[PDB]
Each structure stands twice: as structure tokens, then as C-alpha cells.
Design a protein around this ligand. Structure first.
Ligand SMILES: O=c1nc(NO)ccn1[C@H]1C[C@H](O)[C@@H](COP(=O)(O)O)O1
Ligand SMILES: O=c1nc(NO)ccn1[C@H]1C[C@H](O)[C@@H](COP(=O)(O)O)O1
Lengths: 283, 286
């Protein structure tokens, strides 16, 4: 009944039925290919309670995508340092991006969402009016033709892949309207169940709350679809302890004023209410 | 537990729990957003048995994608007419492409799979060496780095959307290797459960058979993920008839020689063995 039970049941499934599968680093995982969960967004927000999620992170990252930034420093400046390693001098240099300034992640989410198909130069270039503004397109469609079955925002851009500091885990999302309610489905190609997935659910849930607010709809479901769902072998023992915790009721997300456009949202517009995660995993 | 039961349980779910949702066509639907089924490809091929699926069409269509064609006439010449209406004068005209030659679907699957990001001109243009050959990239990666979590072919191209005769229902697919087995997940954004979906499952299961053959792996699973899964209101009675039929075991798919490149497959190289479906059920197209 509690929606977090689906996440825990996925983790239980990978622990019990997953296959050992080597991976790009070399730490090894247990893996299952193809999973799906549905998190209701109706009068609650799916911010996992069996372990704390970095909400400040979720929110600032999402605001950073929306402004179309591809500078890790513009995020880091908000106290959210999750993308900093990927834009470091040594990391960029290792990919052959010696000409880039530190921070320049290349044409990642912000760019694809706002400027798909534009020619990326650097993180400081002016791309005003260039490419497809997928995010505004989705919002426009939801308002004018909510029954449309093509309401997609796609970060996966095969042309641009070699220029990105890393390829996106969240390949595309799709939006859906029925009965005054906005749903979102994420196709996530690769999910670290222990460390990444709870954050990723909160992210796409928050986007859906944001879009539903500006289009005058209510949040429906967040449908989480995974490709390689995995648990790193060093996360097994912590997840078994986590798996013994009963979820606390999900918190509520409140939007504190009437916001007209997606660009106008600010950190202060949001309040998480009644979040009571169980107390205290390496990447 | 017969794999076709998942498809039938999806249809039953939509019939029972779907919402009525108007659509672009005006016929209306019952719809659910977000579904997933897994079809084993291990010593069986998921060609549905509760009605007859147009296998010839599945095979010719996929071959046609593979060679990069965006010319409906080139598929029609094989006796497979499923794209002809999309390339017709009247339809191209309605979309505003009156300068376009009849048959010219614009930058659809074949172009995206073989030339992603190239500048489309017309269906007769020479695109050799232009854009990203995603199909070949996926094959290459499967061979050189089977654990890669980025093995994706994406037909959804927001830049090209406005030039396409129709936007792709199959937005992307991802491949996955473990234990000597090749799996594929399709993200299908919109599924006509009556007419489209059984054909679509066969398409991607066949694609997976083809790639596993080329990369020397065994087919694993086909995971079918749907966005707007819908039943047109006029398919309801035909599907209620179908839901009464008990599935028969799935057929086997045989590949009849060693093929070394995906471009070298021909219709003659495939044999469906033991396909014993219940009769065709006819359903009016939206
Ligand atoms: O769960 C994840 N969520 C992300 N959100 O931005 C990013 C990454 N991941 C995980 C999935 C894999 O563990 C790893 C990415 O490695 P890849 O799948 O090899 O590209 O990080
Ligand atoms: O199920 C489908 N499979 C296709 N495979 O190529 C193509 C189309 N369809 C269905 C889904 C919708 O009923 C219709 C396309 O309409 P749209 O989702 O409104 O773009 O055809």
C-alpha cells in the first residue's frame, strides 16, 4: 500500500534474482534488466523514508536543468556538488576536453532540454533561440492538447553523446493527462538502486509537480521505468538493514505561491512538509 | 506460464481500469499510462497465437528499416502496404509537404537508425557516411563491451519531428547482455493494443534475434514498456472475443544460415516453425 514498498520490493528482487554483472568501473553489481514502479503523486510526495534523500540537491539540480546550464559551478554555487567531479580539470582532460574551462560538462540535460539539436560550443555560449526547447514544448502541449500521445522530453542525443562529460542516465520522459491529472514516465537506462534511484524518483516527481502547477493540473502518477537496475556489491549489507525498516508516511510538497512559467520557479517557492526519514553507502 | 498471458492481462487491465480518453483520431479510447511485460525469447518466439499476426509484414518492415529506407514505395513493392497511406499525396499534402514526392516519409526510423543527426533532404538522397549509424554502433558495442549500460538506439529526434510523416511510436530501445544472453527493452510511447502491439512485440523480438545472431549471443528477454497504452472503443468487442481464446505454445524462429552483418539478412534466411494461431480477428483502423 505505501508506495515506497515498491522500491524496497525492487531492491529485494535484485538481491534475490539479479545476476552478477561486471560494470564500467569494476566494482561489480547485481543486476536485473527491465523494471517498473508507479508512485502516486496525489496528496503526497515520494521522497523515500527508509533512508534520507538529499532534497536540497534534488531541487537545486532541477532548477539548474531548467535554466539550461551546463556549468557544474553554477550548481555547486548553490551548495550542491554532485556534478563537480564530472566537470573537474583532470576529468575533462581525460576525455580530451583540454580546451574547456573547468565545470563545462558539455551538452548535458540543461542543453538538450532547452536547445536540442543546436550546435554546442561551450557552457558560456549564447544559445538563445537555437535548437528545440523541449521543456517549453511539453508545457505548451499539455495546455493546448492534453490528450496528445507525443509529449516527450528527450535528453538522449546520439549526435551529442561524445561531447558530454557523461551520457545521461535519464534517457527521456513522457507526460500524460487524464481526469485533470498529469502523469510522467521516466525511461532510466541505468539505475544505482542504493545511491541514485531515490534521488532520481524525487527529481521527476518534482518536475511533474512543477509542470502540473503551471498548467493548472493536479499531479497523477510518476512511472519509473528502468533498464539496468543494479545494486553495487558494496551496498548489499547496508540495503539489507534498510530493507528491515518500515516506511514512514510520505511527506507533502507545497508550492507556496502562484507561479506562471517554469522559468520563474525559485527554491523558496517549495516546502517539504512532514519528512521523517529513518536515520543513517559509498559511491 | 505462457508469455502471451501478459499481453492478454494488459488488455484485460485496460478494459477494467482504463480511463476513457479522447484522441487525435476522434474514435476515443480506454487508456492506461505506464505498463511493462517481459517476453522470453529463450527457445521460443513471441508471435501471438490468440490472433494471427502479419509476420511477412514484420520481417519486410524490419528489413526495410535496416537498409535505411524512408520510401514507402520500397516496402510496398514487397507486398507490405502498412506505410503506404503515410506516404500518399493526400496525406503528405495535409501535412504541408506538397513539394515532396509520393512515398517520401521524411526522416523516420530507417534514417534515424542509420544516419541520426544528418541533414534530411529527400528519400532518394545519398546519406552514406552522414550522421550516427546507431544500429551498427549497438552491434559494435555488444561485441566489444557487452556490459555497457548505454546500448541504445533512439528514433525520437526532436529536431526532425516536424519533417516526419508520423512521429515514431517506438521512441527508443536499449540492449543488455548478461550470461551470454542479449535482451532488448522498447520504450513504446503509444500502443494500439488491438492492432499495433502484437506486431510491435514481434518486430523487436525479431530485431533481438537478428542482433544476437550477428554478435554470437543467445536471445534473452524482450521487455516491452508502454506509455499510453490504449484500446480504441471499436476494438473492444473484437478483443473480448480474443480474450476467450486460450494461447497455444509460441512458435520457434529459425535462422537458416550464418549471417555476418545486419545488412546481409534477407527474407529467405528466416523460418517461423510451428505457428498455429487462432484465426485473424479484423479490427477497424483508427
Ligand atoms: O542511478 C543513477 N542516476 C543518475 N542520475 O543522474 C546518474 C547515474 N546513476 C548511476 C547508474 C550507474 O550506476 C552509474 C552510471 O554509469 P553508467 O550506467 O555506466 O553510465 O550511475
Ligand atoms: O501501436 C502502434 N504501433 C506503431 N508501430 O509502428 C505505430 C502506431 N501505433 C498506434 C498508437 C496509436 O494508436 C497510433 C499513433 O497515434 P499517436 O500515438 O496519436 O501518434 O497508432
Amino acid at each position: 500500500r505505501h508506495g515506497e514498498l515498491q522500491y524496497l520490493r525492487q531492491v529485494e528482487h535484485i538481491l534475490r534474482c539479479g545476476f552478477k554483472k561486471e560494470d564500467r568501473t569494476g566494482t561489480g553489481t547485481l543486476s536485473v534488466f527491465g523494471m517498473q514502479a508507479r508512485y502516486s503523486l496525489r496528496d503526497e510526495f515520494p521522497l523515500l523514508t527508509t533512508k534520507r534523500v538529499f532534497w536540497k540537491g534534488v531541487l537545486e539540480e532541477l532548477l539548474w536543468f531548467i535554466k539550461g546550464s551546463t556549468n557544474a559551478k553554477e550548481l555547486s554555487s548553490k551548495g550542491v556538488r554532485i556534478w563537480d567531479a564530472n566537470g573537474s580539470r583532470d576529468f575533462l582532460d581525460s576525455l580530451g576536453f583540454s580546451a574547456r574551462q573547468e565545470g563545462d560538462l558539455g551538452p548535458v540535460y540543461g542543453f538538450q532540454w532547452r536547445h536540442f539539436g543546436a550546435e554546442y560550443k561551450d557552457m558560456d555560449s549564447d544559445y538563445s533561440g537555437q535548437g528545440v526547447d523541449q521543456l517549453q514544448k511539453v508545457i505548451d502541449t499539455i495546455k493546448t492538447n492534453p490528450d496528445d500521445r507525443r509529449i516527450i522530453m528527450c535528453a538522449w542525443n546520439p549526435k551529442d553523446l561524445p561531447l558530454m562529460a557523461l551520457p545521461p542516465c535519464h534517457a527521456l520522459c513522457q507526460f500524460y493527462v487524464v481526469n485533470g491529472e498529469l502523469s510522467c514516465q521516466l525511461y532510466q537506462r541505468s539505475g544505482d538502486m542504493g545511491l541514485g534511484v531515490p534521488f532520481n524518483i524525487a527529481s521527476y516527481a518534482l518536475l511533474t509537480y512543477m509542470i502540473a502547477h503551471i498548467t493548472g493540473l493536479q499531479p497523477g502518477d510518476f512511472v519509473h521505468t528502468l533498464g539496468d537496475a543494479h545494486i553495487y556489491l558494496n551496498h548489499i549489507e547496508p540495503l539489507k538493514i534498510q530493507l528491515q525498516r518500515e516506511p514512514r508516511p510520505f511527506p507533502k510538497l507545497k508550492i507556496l505561491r502562484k507561479v506562471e512559467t517554469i522559468d520563474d520557479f525559485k527554491v523558496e517557492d517549495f516546502q517539504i512538509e512532514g519528512y521523517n526519514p529513518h536515520p543513517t553507502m559509498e559511491m
